[PDB]
């Protein structure tokens, strides 16, 4: 999943970011590693619908 | 024998340009399979995109760039 995320990001090496995205994008890995923090991994791109711009 | 590919039909001016493109090796490959007719030729399916792009480029090479002028 991390290599897929890396290829999707057009990168040749899996870095902490790709590991975080792979872990948090999978429903089961996210549950297995819910209490786990990954260094330099950041967070999933997430914005709530109410926050998005309007007229 | 039988050959895979794509046929393209156009006026003979474009047909000459198409023959010129591989004859001059502009694309580096003999993409024309055979001389079908004055307005018809058969070409490899994978190169049709750059071929269409070169035809598009040839128009711009022979057309005024309006560009809000």
């Amino acid at each position: 999943l991390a290599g897929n995320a890396a290829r999707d990001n057009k990168k040749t090496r899996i870095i902490p970011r790709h590991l975080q995205l792979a872990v948090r994008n999978d429903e089961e890995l996210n549950k297995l590693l819910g209490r786990v923090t990954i260094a330099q991994g950041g967070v999933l791109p997430n914005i709530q619908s109410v926050l998005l711009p309007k007229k | 024998n039988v050959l895979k590919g794509v046929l393209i039909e156009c006026d003979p001016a474009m047909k000459q340009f198409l023959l010129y493109l591989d004859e001059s090796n502009a694309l580096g490959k003999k993409f024309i399979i055979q001389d079908i007719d004055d307005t018809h030729v058969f070409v490899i399916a994978e190169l049709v995109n750059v071929l269409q792009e070169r035809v598009g480029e040839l128009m711009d090479q022979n057309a005024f760039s309006l560009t809000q002028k």
Partner: protein
Amino acid sequence: LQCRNLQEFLGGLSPGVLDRLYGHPATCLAVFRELPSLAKNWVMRMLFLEQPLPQAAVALWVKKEFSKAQEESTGLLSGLRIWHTQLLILNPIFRQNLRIALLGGQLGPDKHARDVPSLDKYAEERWEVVLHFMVGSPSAAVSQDLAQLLSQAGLMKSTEPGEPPCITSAGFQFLLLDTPAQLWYFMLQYLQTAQSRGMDLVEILSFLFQLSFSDSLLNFLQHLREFGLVFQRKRKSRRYYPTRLAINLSSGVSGAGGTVHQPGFIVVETNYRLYAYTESELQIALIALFSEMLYRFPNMVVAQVTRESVQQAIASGITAQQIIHFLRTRAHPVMLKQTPVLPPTITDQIRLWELERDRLRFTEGVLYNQFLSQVDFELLLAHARELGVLVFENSAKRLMVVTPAGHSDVKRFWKRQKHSS
């Protein structure tokens, strides 16, 4: 899939659905008024006849002239299975429901009685916001059902998971259509996607006919309100008021005249410059699809129709026909005086730019060469022609090319022919 008229949908109907669709409240009135000027007479004549009659009578009742129109209309009504030859006896359900439809056979507290102008304005407003969402507007009205609907309608596609949906080749063509035609395609796709998604087309379509004059209907009716086709002050009201657009329905531009009964605004100059007396950004967005916009004023926009913007539009999927139509249908009153309304130089230039875009016609095919004889070559050619598999031929040069799918058949035949040895 440019289903420009009802007739295509009418053919897409089986007896197992036609009989149920042939309900007494609206289908009979809607179908009958949509039948040709000829068949309407015969159907009305046989409304009291319980015994079939021979086709020769219908044939001899029409002149040699117009017989083709009678045959064509006969083909439609026979295709609609409205009657049986049994040798043209009408279907009992159709005859009975048509009879009841002539006379018929429900009330409550008063409604808000909102003004008809208000209804049609918010209906137009509702359709406009649907188009504002359809176009590349940075902000527009959205809804999960509306989005997937437009997507399943083949008008929009999502390039990436989570990114806003973008327009398809058909979507660009669709955007330029006139409101009635544009709405028609949407209605047709909704109907097709309704049966696909499990909504009983019979009930909702019959309801559409009624609007032109159950939980499934309530769900469907809720969508119609979201489309602005019907007014309902509050979700609790059991009664609704059909809007002008819903009343028009499948009537088309032939009924009550085309949407051209509106103030024109596009001015087209011989220098490819456009001046559109407009404030509605939707028109601007559409104009921007094929013209380079230069200046914007409070009530007008200045743009120019260039090779770049037009060939970009053509590359996106648009046609000069749609562009010329979009302009002509929106042409400003001032340019209506000249004939043609659009300047010939402009129309010819636009057409010539699209015709340049397709100077080369690309067609997939398989080419056989080095035919050992003209006889077997022509024999194989005759088979390719008999199969309709032929793409191009030059017998003088002893060559031919065929479609890849059809090639498998000539490949098989060639092997069969060769295996005769």
